[PDB]
Amino acid sequence: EVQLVESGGGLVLPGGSLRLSCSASGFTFSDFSMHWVRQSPGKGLEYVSAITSSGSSTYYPDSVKGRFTISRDNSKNTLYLQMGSLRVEDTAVYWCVKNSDVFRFPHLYFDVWGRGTLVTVSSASTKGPSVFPLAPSSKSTSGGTAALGCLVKDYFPEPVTVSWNSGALTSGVHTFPAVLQSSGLYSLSSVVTVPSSSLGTQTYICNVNHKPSNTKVDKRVEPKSC
Amino acid sequence: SKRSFIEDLLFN
Amino acid sequence: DIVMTQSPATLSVSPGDRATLSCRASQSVSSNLAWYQQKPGQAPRLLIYGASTRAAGIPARFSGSGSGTEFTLTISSLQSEDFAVYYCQQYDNWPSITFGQGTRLEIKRTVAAPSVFIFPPSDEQLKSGTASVVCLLNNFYPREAKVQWKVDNALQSGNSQESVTEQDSKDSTYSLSSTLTLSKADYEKHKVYACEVTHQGLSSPVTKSFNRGEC
């Protein structure tokens, strides 16, 4: 199928520089124009750069002109966004986005989107999380089901990704919005409800990844004897 | 390519 | 620039019913308009292009209409999976484009009481000098729920944080997580840790508790 796989991003200092990448598969990349679209509070969704199928022309809104540069390498099927002179206002999720074929003119719309990269412009330092088990016990069971989870505490900046059993476990998971602690660090919990009956035969591992600090933690969550 | 030419018209 | 204005900002519709979402362009964009559906933390997904042409693989209950400045997205036979924020986008000046500010579609359902669970702090964390106690409220509706932390039956204030999930795409419920965090030294000064939960779906509050010495 068609895919846009985004890499790059994370934390960057005010006035700093950062390059995002997006590799394309499943279609003829050199046939389609691409946009970078960003999303942040207040401003919502807004494009920040556009480039033709061949890279022959680029288009920028006034807000980013002279600071952001879009480019593509159709040999490696990769789209780039070079971000310079970064501003506090530039914190946003940055989406790689594919346009429909220009032969559809005037209907040039966004039919394929990457998964987004969160860029955080801040002078603060990165901090990876501590991951603690939320162990199942008699205090987290009801009606034949048992709740368990992981507490992902004290990281900066967002985001952390949490999966369960390397993605084999998705049903019944709730990974909560992070909270901002008075320290300026984030904390989040991720929980899952499973059968009480199989706690002794099944293995539950939360996989935590904090890409801004390159911290990856797998925590096995064992039942507690209470 | 044919597409590049039309996209240039739109970008300019 | 062309300004896209959506209305309403939010709406709440029962499953099986028909939702009407509006988008107004500040000047005519002919039919050069697209609709996108974005669930939280996911990429927007194209629903309609050309104001009224449904994108491949999109369910028939999504329908776009309009031309010029007034555009409508109609979602019939609404499903819990249709929870999302819906954006319109004009591409009349492509590659220059603008998006509307979004309409958040919330699914109504019947009242559902929370399932309440409590988690004592881990030994890993205690060795670090901190105790976090977590109270979990699973799969309730409506969103409004109150959590009170009681330590040795004393109501707590100022040492907890909570957040609620986005609406669940399968059953339209909410879940809530609340963390009470104390220093290890303060944790060891008390015995009973409890969370008391109030919700429309519960006739009386539900209290989950443990004793620090038992877990």
**Amino acid, single-letter form, for residue A122:** S
Give the experimental resolution in Å: 1.9
Of C73, C107, C141, the domain-final residue:
C107
Asked which of C89, C107, C125 is the last residue of a domain, the reply is C107
Q: Do A58 and B1 touch (CB under 8 A)?
A: no
Pairing of strands C10-13, C103-107: parallel
Domain shared by C186 and C129, yes or no: yes
In terms of domains, do C205 and C139 share one?
yes
- Using the Cβ of B4 and the Cβ atoms of chain C, whether some distance falls under 8 Å is answered with no
d(CA C124, CA A58): 52
A63 sits in the region (left: phi over 0; alpha: psi -120 to 50; else beta) called: alpha
| Six token digits for residue C68 | 């010029």
Q: Cα(A44)–Cα(A40) distance, rounded to whole angstroms?
A: 5
CA C176 – CA C195 distance, rounded (Å): 12
Distances (CA, A) of C79 to A52, A139, C20, C76, C130: 38, 34, 14, 9, 43
Asked, colleague to colleague, whether A3-121 and A130-220 share their fold, the answer is yes
Q: For residues C155 and C75, state if they share a domain.
A: no
Tell me the CATH number for domain A130-220. 2.60.40.10
Q: Residue C99 and residue A111: Cβ atoms within 8 Å? A: no
Residues of B in contact with A105 (CB under 8 A): 6, 10
Q: Are C11 and C65 in contact (CB under 8 A)?
A: no
Q: Mark whether C169 and C122 lie in a shared domain.
A: yes
Select from A24, A200, A187 the least CA-distant residue to A114.
A24
Domain span holding position C10: 4-107
A40 and chain C in contact, CB less than 8 A: no
CB-based contact A113:A201 (threshold 8 Å): no
CATH number at residue C27: 2.60.40.10
| Rounded Cα gap, residues C83 and C12, in angstroms | 10
Q: Please tell me if residue A45 touches chain C, with a CB cutoff of 8 Å.
A: yes
- Considering the domain architecture, whether residues C83 and C43 belong to the same structural domain is answered as yes
CB distance A178 to C142 below 8 Å: no
Same domain for C133 and C88: no
Report the gap between the CA of B4 and the closest CA in chain A (Å).
6
Write out chain B residues lying below 8 Å of C94, CB-based: 10
Interchain pair A113, C44: CB under 8 A: yes
Q: Are residues C56 and C141 in the same domain?
A: no
Domain boundaries defined on chain A = 3-121, 130-220
Helix (H) or strand (E) holding C187: helix C184-187
Deposited experimental method: X-ray
- Homologous superfamily (CATH) of A3-121 is Immunoglobulins (2.60.40.10)
Question: How many structural domains are present in chain C?
Answer: 2
Domain boundary among C63, C90, C107: C107
Pick from C55, C119, C161: CB nearest A135: C119
